Design a protein around this ligand. Structure first.
Ligand code: NI
Length: 341
């Protein structure tokens, strides 16, 4: 059945709750972003109002064929009324089109649902600065102190410098980058920009990218693989077997592959700096796992919450085990005692 952490008290609303059938008493279904664990259940047969960003609404129409009459896109950073309740959508610094949702309940309670987010100090100067938030529905993906990672900027600097060196030493090397969802487009776009190439990809992935309102996108991507030396493949093909196979398909144009897997966290992070990352190599194939995250590190999460000072926190991730739930609640109490709220 629908879990309680997907329901907004005092409303008829749910968040990211499309796989439970008709949720009893739900008048408006919000969708924070277009990732499959959150949209699971939507299709052309859905007939309830879906509230989302413009970008998510483009993907619902074009990829899932949801009918236009049930898609209700909202502008960001704008007070809107939905079924009699004031709401605001804020940028979540996750994947394209991802939002956090502020609800202003008729009784005076204010609720923030982060969806999936990567906390940032820039959020301290949005419309969140303007009033008190009482309850926080928090993306707790990496809520433990072992989870450190570098800035996105440091990671992209590493990737650009690595790719440019490799291709300048060998102009017959191909760069491959893995993907299995939207998000992390900076990785492949930044590498293609330094190399003077478009990114080549499947027709399905090109269609998906054309929904994202990215500026000058026609100049950066293509379905013509032959004209490109940065290729995007499914994450599943980013291994020695899959890469050897792909190289065969390129008809002797290339004699080496340098491949990137933008993972979330991996335990080489507790020891190793970004400067010190090395690939796995077999023959003329090298694979780099780079820690490009679109979720908060532990320290980023803690800073956001200690700034916001909510009265009550409701985790939305890692909620399935008692040991995880108890660990998270211990951190919440530490943060509150350190900060004095
Ligand atoms: Ni997500």
């Amino acid at each position: 059945t629908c879990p309680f952490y997907k329901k907004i008290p005092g409303t008829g609303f749910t968040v990211d709750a499309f796989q439970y059938g008709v949720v009893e008493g739900c008048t408006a279904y919000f969708l924070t972003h277009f990732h499959s664990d959150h949209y699971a259940g939507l299709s052309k047969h859905f007939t309830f109002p879906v509230y989302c960003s413009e970008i998510t609404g483009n993907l619902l129409k074009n990829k899932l064929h949801v009918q236009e009459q049930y898609i209700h896109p909202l502008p960001l950073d704008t007070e809107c009324i939905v079924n009699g309740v004031k709401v605001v959508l804020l940028d979540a610094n996750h994947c394209p089109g991802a939002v956090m949702i502020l609800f202003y309940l008729p009784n005076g309670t204010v609720i923030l649902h982060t969806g999936d987010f990567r906390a940032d100090p820039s959020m301290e100067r949005s419309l969140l600065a303007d009033q008190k938030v009482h309850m926080l529905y928090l993306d707790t993906t990496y809520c433990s102190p072992e989870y450190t990672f570098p800035s996105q900027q440091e990671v992209i600097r590493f990737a650009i410098n690595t790719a440019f060196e490799a291709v300048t030493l060998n102009p017959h090397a191909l760069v491959v980058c893995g993907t299995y969802s939207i998000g992390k487009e900076k990785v492949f776009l930044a590498i293609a920009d330094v190399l003077g190439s478009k990114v080549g990809m499947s027709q399905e992935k090109y269609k998906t990218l054309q929904c994202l309102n990215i500026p000058e996108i026609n100049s950066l991507i293509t379905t013509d693989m032959c004209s490109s030396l940065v290729h995007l493949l499914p994450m599943m093909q980013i291994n020695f077997k899959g890469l050897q196979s792909h190289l065969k398909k390129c008809g002797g144009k290339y004699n080496q592959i340098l491949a990137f897997r933008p993972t979330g966290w991996t335990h080489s992070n507790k020891f190793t700096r970004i400067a010190d990352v090395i690939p796995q190599t077999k023959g003329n194939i090298s694979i780099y796992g780079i820690p490009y995250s679109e979720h908060s590190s532990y320290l980023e999460m803690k800073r956001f919450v200690q700034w916001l000072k909510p009265q009550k926190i409701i985790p939305t991730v890692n909620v399935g085990t008692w040991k995880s739930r108890s660990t998270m609640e211990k951190y919440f109490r530490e943060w509150k005692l350190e900060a004095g709220y």
